[PDB]
């Protein structure tokens, strides 16, 4: 029913960071159909930094920061005959962190029949 | 693979108690790019009323907001399955003052991401 995050996260230069993001709570009868990560002033060409779908997996769109510096820490597509996909701890980490990588990050849920709800995280250094 | 842009019209302009469509259709045609869901957003609306119409590829449409609201609220092309979500177009009926504003048409793509295109209407 909402998307939590933390409004403001600083991340140690050349390190690892982690933007928390979790649909809450587990509600029967609503899917999450993709997840996405953007930087809302980045322009278009780079502004999808980060997707995820259930059967599919991850995919990292924009070059910058590109999938070399970036990581699903908990969305796992499905698999098997049983494993279904969990994608409610949308959870992105970004690696070799650099001052480009500084701004705004909106982590959004594309879900039916509710449609799409997002909840935004500033990056500084 | 070639990115996608959605295409919408700047403005739209619709009389009073009539319907009128807000055209919007993803493009190019890409291999391997899934539309996973499509939604139409009032951005500028209070947050329960923000999520107008929904469309999932197997699931159909929903009508999340009460404002225009699933009585005056119709996707014109989108079929549920072949899926067909390419054509977003949607349709308002009944037409008001109240329904005035921006509407932002979204697919949420896979491998791409999430892409819009907003359009003004006008009453």
Same mark, same amino acid.
């Given at each position: &029913?909402?998307?939590? &995050? $933390?409004?403001?996260?600083?991340? %140690? ?5 982690? $933007?928390?993001?979790? $649909? ?10 993709? &997840?996405? @990560?953007?930087?809302?002033? *980045?322009?278009?060409?780079? %502004?999808?930094?980060?997707? =995820?779908?259930? #059967?599919?997996?991850?995919? =990292?769109?924009?070059? #910058? ?6 990581? =699903?820490?908990?969305? #796992?597509?499905?698999?098997?005959? /049983?494993?279904? *996909?969990? $994608?409610? /701890? ?10 480009? /990588? ?6 959004? =849920?594309?879900?039916?029949? #509710? ?6 995280? @500033?990056?500084?250094?």
């Amino acid at each position: &029913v909402r998307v939590q &995050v $933390l409004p403001e996260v600083r991340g %140690q230069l050349g390190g690892t960071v982690e $933007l928390p993001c979790h $649909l809450l709570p587990p509600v029967p009868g609503l899917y999450i159909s993709l &997840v996405t @990560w953007q930087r809302p002033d *980045a322009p278009a060409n780079h %502004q999808n930094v980060a997707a =995820f779908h259930p #059967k599919m997996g991850p995919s =990292f769109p924009s070059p #910058k920061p590109g999938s070399e510096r970036l990581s =699903f820490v908990s969305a #796992k597509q499905s698999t098997g005959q /049983d494993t279904e *996909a969990e $994608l409610q /701890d949308a959870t992105l980490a970004l690696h070799g962190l650099t001052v480009e /990588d500084e701004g705004n990050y909106t982590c959004e =849920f594309a879900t039916f029949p #509710k449609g799409s709800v997002r909840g935004m995280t @500033w990056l500084r250094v």
